[PDB]
Amino acid sequence: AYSTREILLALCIRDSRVHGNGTLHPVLELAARETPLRLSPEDTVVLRYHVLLEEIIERNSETFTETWNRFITHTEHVDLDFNSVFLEIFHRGDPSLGRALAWMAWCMHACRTLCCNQSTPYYVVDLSVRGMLEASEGLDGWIHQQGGWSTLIEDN
Amino acid sequence: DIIRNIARHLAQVGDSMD
Helix, strand or coil: CCCHHHHHHHHHHHHHHCCCCCCCCHHHHHHHHHCCCCCCCCCHHHHHHHHHHHHHHHHCHHHHHHHHHHHHHHCCCHHHHHHHHHHHHHCCCCCCHHHHHHHHHHHHHHHHHHHCCCCCCHHHHHHHHHHHHHHHHHHHHHHHHCCCHHHHHHCC | CHHHHHHHHHHHHHHHCC
């Protein structure tokens, strides 16, 4: 199966290739080496999720823009706060398909906004990718109960 | 309450999709 870390990272890379000038942030490329990403970002399962997550982003663009901007401008430890936010949604609340998709979409939007802005310090991209990827490991148990990332979107 | 609120918005978007 695919871990949430793999799939989210594949998604950020995939999304990178269909935005901007297509180039890949060093922080992301290094993440693909260190995880190590075995899932291709051109994998059909990544293609589906990428289209879905972008649709969720569009439908909720004002919300995603205001929440992300508020988050990144007031954080003093963005990696820790990724874990804090996740916690509110998924430990102090029950996980659902809805909540999982919103979380993934929000993380992908986060990574796009950071990396499409060349004035963004590397350490910020570094801590943000670190944060969103560890917090997202928390879904593994739940989505495994649900049959995996591949099963969640394709069958139904 | 920034983190709590952000998490609430995302909970709502998640819930509006169910």
